[PDB]
Design a binder for this molecule. Structure first.
Ligand SMILES: *[C@@H]1O[C@H](CO)[C@@H](O)[C@H](O)[C@H]1NC(C)=O
Ligand SMILES: *[C@@H]1O[C@H](CO)[C@@H](O)[C@H](O)[C@H]1NC(C)=O
Ligand SMILES: [Co+2]
Ligand SMILES: [Co+2]
Ligand SMILES: [Co+2]
Ligand SMILES: [Co+2]
Lengths: 165, 165
C-alpha cells in the first residue's frame, strides 16, 4: 500500500450557531507519510492564526493528528462553508463544515416596500389596527424576503414596525 | 381615642416590572373598628376579583389586616398608579403604588418621520452606511420621542430599521 489520508470529523459537519456565539470546528485524521500544508479556508480566504494543528500522540509511531478551527463571535454573514485541506507526498484530502448562523430578522423600508433578512428565512405578517432577492447591503441577513400587501419573524426572534398614511 | 386606620406597605411603593411579568402589591394595615369597603383602583376602574383581603390573625382581638393585588402579565400601557382604599365608621385611608413597566422601544414611520415609544424614554441613534409627543395609538409605549435628521434603544432593549432613497 502507498500513502493515505483519512479524515474523521469530531463534531457534526452541519453546525448551527446563534448570532454572536462561538464554535470550534474539530477534525481528527490519520495520515502517512507526515501530513503537510494544513489549511482552513472560508470564501477563498485562508485563516492564518485562528486554527491549530497537533499530533494526537507524542509517541513516534503516531499517524493520528488533530486540527481545530476556532470561530469566535460569528455574524450572520459569516455563515457558510468552512473547508479543511491537508496533504502529503502522495494524497490530497479535504473535509467541509456547513456553518449556519441564526439571526433575528432585519427589516428595511425604501408606495413603500418592506424587506426582511436573516436566517432562517423570515416570514412576514401584517396586522391592522411575496418575492425573494439577494442583496449584499442592508438589510444584513443570509436569506432575504420581500412581502407586499410590517411584522417579520423566525424561530430565533421577531422584529416589527408600523406604517400609516 | 377614636377610630383609626394606619397603613404600612410590605413592598416598596415604587415598583419596576419587566414587560409581561407579574407583581403582587401587598399592604398590611391596622384598623379599629372593623375595616370596610376595601378597594383597589387603577384608572377609575375597580378590580373586582384580582385582589384578596384577610385578617393577619385568626384571634378575636386582631386589628391587623392584609390586602394583596395580583397583577399578572403587565403591559407597558398598564403602568401607572394603583391605589388601595379602606375605611371604617370613623376614618378613611388610602395608599398608592407607582408601577413602572419596562418595555423595549416600538418604532413607526409615516420626508418620513421616525417615532419611538416605550419605557424608559427611548433614545434614537442614526448610522450611515428632536421633540416629544403623547399618542394613544401606535406606537405603544409610556414615553414617546421623535427624532429628525433609524435606531432606537433603552436600558431594556433595542429596535432598528433602515431607510434609503
Ligand atoms: C448532527 O449534530 C447534532 C448536534 O449538533 C446532533 O444532535 C445530530 O444527531 C447530528 N446528526 C447526525 C449525527 O446525523
Ligand atoms: C425600593 O425597593 C427596591 C426593591 O424593589 C429596593 O432595592 C430599594 O432599596 C427600595 N427603596 C427604599 C426602601 O427606599
Ligand atoms: Co496559534
Ligand atoms: Co421561501
Ligand atoms: Co378571589
Ligand atoms: Co427627554
Amino acid at each position: 500500500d502507498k500513502g493515505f489520508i483519512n479524515i474523521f470529523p469530531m463534531i457534526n459537519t452541519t453546525v448551527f450557531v446563534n448570532d454572536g456565539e462561538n464554535v470550534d470546528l474539530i477534525v481528527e485524521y490519520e495520515a502517512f507519510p507526515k501530513p503537510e500544508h494544513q489549511q482552513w479556508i472560508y470564501m477563498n480566504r485562508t485563516f492564518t492564526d485562528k486554527w491549530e494543528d497537533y499530533p494526537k500522540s507524542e509517541n513516534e509511531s503516531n499517524i493520528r493528528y488533530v486540527s481545530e478551527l476556532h470561530l469566535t463571535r460569528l455574524k450572520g454573514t459569516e455563515g457558510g462553508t468552512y473547508t479543511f485541506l491537508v496533504s502529503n507526498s502522495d494524497v490530497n484530502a479535504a473535509i467541509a463544515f456547513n456553518v449556519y448562523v441564526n439571526t433575528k430578522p432585519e427589516i428595511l423600508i425604501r408606495m413603500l416596500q418592506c424587506v426582511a433578512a436573516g436566517f432562517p428565512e423570515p416570514t412576514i405578517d401584517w396586522y391592522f389596527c411575496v418575492q425573494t432577492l439577494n442583496s449584499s447591503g442592508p438589510p444584513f441577513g443570509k436569506l432575504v424576503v420581500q412581502s407586499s400587501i410590517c411584522k417579520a419573524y423566525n424561530d430565533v426572534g421577531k422584529t416589527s414596525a408600523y406604517f400609516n398614511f
